[PDB]
Amino acid sequence: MFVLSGGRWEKTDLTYRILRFPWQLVREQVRQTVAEALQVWSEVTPLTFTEVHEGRADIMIDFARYWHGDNLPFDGPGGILAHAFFPKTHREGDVHFDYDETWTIGDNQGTDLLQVAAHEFGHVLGLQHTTAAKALMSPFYTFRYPLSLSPDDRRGIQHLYG
Ligand SMILES: NC(=O)[C@H](Cc1c[nH]c2ccccc12)NC(=O)[C@H](CCCc1ccccc1)CP(=O)(O)[C@@H](Cc1ccccc1)NC(=O)OCc1ccccc1
Ligand SMILES: [Ca+2]
Numbered sequence: 014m015f016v017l018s019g020g021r022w023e024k025t026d027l028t029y030r031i032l033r034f035p036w037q038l039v040r041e042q043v044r045q046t047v048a049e050a051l052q053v054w055s056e057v058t059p060l061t062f063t064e065v066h067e068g069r070a071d072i073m074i075d076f077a078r079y080w081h082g083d084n085l086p087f088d089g090p091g092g093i094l095a096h097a098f099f100p101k102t103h104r105e106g107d108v109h110f111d112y113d114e115t116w117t118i119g120d121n122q123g124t125d126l127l128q129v130a131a132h133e134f135g136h137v138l139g140l141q142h143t144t145a146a147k148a149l150m151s152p153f154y155t156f157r158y159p160l161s162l163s164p165d166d167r168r169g170i171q172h173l174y175g
């Protein structure tokens with residue numbers, strides 16, 4: 014598909030690249046998680062996601078600590094867990110996870126990668142925060158399973174996309 018957007022015919026098939034991985038998780042698990050977090054959005058939008066292993070993609074994902082050259086320094090364990098921003102000098106969506114967190118998957122004790130990632134991909138796609146507590150786009154993280162769009166989340170997507 015081609016979808017008319019912003020007055021222009023844009024492409025819906027997109028690429029993303031994982032630049033570095035968190036140390037507490039094995040690569041394959043981080044890969045499946047990132048894909049699964051992107052899929053919660055692709056299910057309710059005209060977008061598709063493909064993983065690339067070189068060059069620049071539409072979505073660049075990285076795990077960094079503190080200062081990593083973007084004026085959004087991370088703050089070590091806790092606090093901010095990640096963020097996503099649009100660099101002016103590159104046509105891409107940048108998402109960085111704070112390497113200092115105890116990254117986990119499916120464990121209510123650690124910091125869930127599936128949730129933080131789904132949240133960041135939400136930004137990349139245009140959504141902003143909401144006050145709904147159990148919303149994927151809430152400003153605050155609380156372990157919540159399964160990963161699912163709340164009504165406020167579907168409305169948000171329906172507002173930005175058809
Ligand atoms: N652990 C959290 O919940 C925190 C918020 C928080 C709670 N206690 C704190 C003590 C000190 C500092 C921050 C916090 N959220 C995050 O880390 C957020 C990402 C994960 C949330 C998520 C995951 C799963 C389900 C639901 C929610 C960070 P962010 O929201 O993506 C990011 C947005 C942003 C992107 C690009 C540019 C600016 C801002 N925020 C953030 O606040 O970044 C820096 C900043 C700090 C204060 C004001 C403006 C900007
Ligand atoms: Ca942190």
Ligand SMILES: [Zn+2]
Pocket residue numbers: 077081083085096109
């Ligand atoms: Zn960063």
Ligand SMILES: [Zn+2]
Pocket residue numbers: 132136142150151152
């Ligand atoms: Zn956020």
